[PDB]
Design a protein around this ligand. Sequence first.
Ligand code: APR
Ligand code: APR
Ligand code: NA
Ligand code: NA
Lengths: 249, 249
Amino acid sequence: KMRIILCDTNEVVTNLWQESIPKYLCIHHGHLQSLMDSMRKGDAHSYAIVSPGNSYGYLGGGFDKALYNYFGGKPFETWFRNQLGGRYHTVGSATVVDLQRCLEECRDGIRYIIHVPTVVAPSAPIFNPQNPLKTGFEPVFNAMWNALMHSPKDIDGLIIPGLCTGYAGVPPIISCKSMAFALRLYMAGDHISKELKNVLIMYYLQYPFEPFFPESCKIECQKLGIDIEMLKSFNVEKDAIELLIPRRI
Amino acid sequence: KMRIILCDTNEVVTNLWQESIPKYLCIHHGHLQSLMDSMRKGDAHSYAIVSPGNSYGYLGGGFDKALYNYFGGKPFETWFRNQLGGRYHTVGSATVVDLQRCLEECRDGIRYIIHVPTVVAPSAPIFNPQNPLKTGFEPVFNAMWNALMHSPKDIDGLIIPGLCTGYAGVPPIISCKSMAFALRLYMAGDHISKELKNVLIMYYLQYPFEPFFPESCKIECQKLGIDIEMLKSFNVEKDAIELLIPRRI
Ligand SMILES: Nc1ncnc2c1ncn2[C@@H]1O[C@H](COP(=O)(O)OP(=O)(O)OC[C@H]2O[C@@H](O)[C@H](O)[C@@H]2O)[C@@H](O)[C@H]1O
Ligand SMILES: Nc1ncnc2c1ncn2[C@@H]1O[C@H](COP(=O)(O)OP(=O)(O)OC[C@H]2O[C@@H](O)[C@H](O)[C@@H]2O)[C@@H](O)[C@H]1O
Ligand code: NA
Ligand code: NA
């Protein structure tokens, strides 16, 4: 129903998206601006744009900069930061900014910006090859999961760029995988219970805590064709997402 | 106006709280249960309890366990998890659960539980001495900041235990410092602009990004008696919070 548009100027990101994801979803290699211009020859449709930002709402670089240019520059940034309460928002949070208030700056079919801080400030990458899990796989998944969970149900399409793949410095190979996983859970709809999705996330993030693996979910894995042994030993650095969410689903 | 009650069974945590914090705030060494029993000889008052939990809302250990016992055990946990949508909530998020619905389980003057996930699951500590900042100072500050920002404005008191100091495995000496800082910013009220607080957080977390340090905040530091040089070089492991928020304020 809701179209998901993955947009990014880095072909490495777009190529990786093509590989890890099975209409309902579209991939666009190129600038957001052009995708927007391109978004004027179809409906002759309201969207929300996920933007990986900083904890303060400044839009001085990366994807945020495209948003800054496209929506009115420095007055828009000023307005934007005020919508966020002008204060610190933690990485792990997500805030929807309604552009409808433009009527009090309006443009195209974009009504929302889902602000998801990926860095406190771009003073240094968040990534550390010593632990690609805590500084890569996990933060990207969380940012994607929150953006999806916060997506207004009234929109026609959701525009999302690579997350943490710019100033945050997370390798695309790592980010794309977590984005693909979050999206795969979301697209599984009700074919997988919420509880089982919770369990799949827990093992994907390598937190093998048995007490949080209910028997009902074990029965559901057997019914869905998910190998429980491989689930309990899922290694985010070597195993395919398919082992958690079979495409047959 | 709003009373803040720091409660914890670990005397190391309570002792450290005494040292890093200057009525409006109370410290209680002891079990939450007894503080609640104690909370019946004063008003002859509605509170909110901050609870450091996991991403799934299970209440099987630590402070959450006290909540589990006190509010109805396994039916309460079941109800609690449903209030959270029965799904994954990221570390960095905060969700207020209204116990008012008890009338459809009601007890004392507690109306809210501010659920702040500090771990995905208690399968291992989140702390790593290799980087006490990214795995200690920062996550504790974020959890405290969010709990405070999410505190309902209608409550009389806010009950908070040590955050990340149990199953998360963050040393009290580190956690208490970040909790003290978050609380010091909050208690500074309007005596410090929101923007300056943003800057103090940024440097406290060691993200020295100059472009995010507005000139107006520099002028405000000079006016408030804050040494800008020491701000730009604040070292969370060696410098006193006082250097960021002078007690004279
Ligand atoms: N105009 C654009 N169009 C499409 N994609 C873009 C554009 N500009 C950047 N991108 C892509 O968007 C992705 C996101 O990178 P960033 O914007 O840098 O975000 P990430 O979390 O790394 O970093 C966010 C941080 O960087 C700051 O610019 C931003 O304010 C925030 O503090 C990258 O894969 C990048 O190639
Ligand atoms: N009954 C109690 N009364 C007062 N303080 C208590 C009590 N039980 C524990 N505490 C204190 O509360 C603090 C919080 O520790 P945890 O509850 O373990 O929480 P922290 O983030 O480490 O870990 C949360 C994680 O542990 C799990 O139990 C919980 O569900 C979550 O997954 C500690 O300083 C601990 O001494
Ligand atoms: Na950005
Ligand atoms: Na707890």
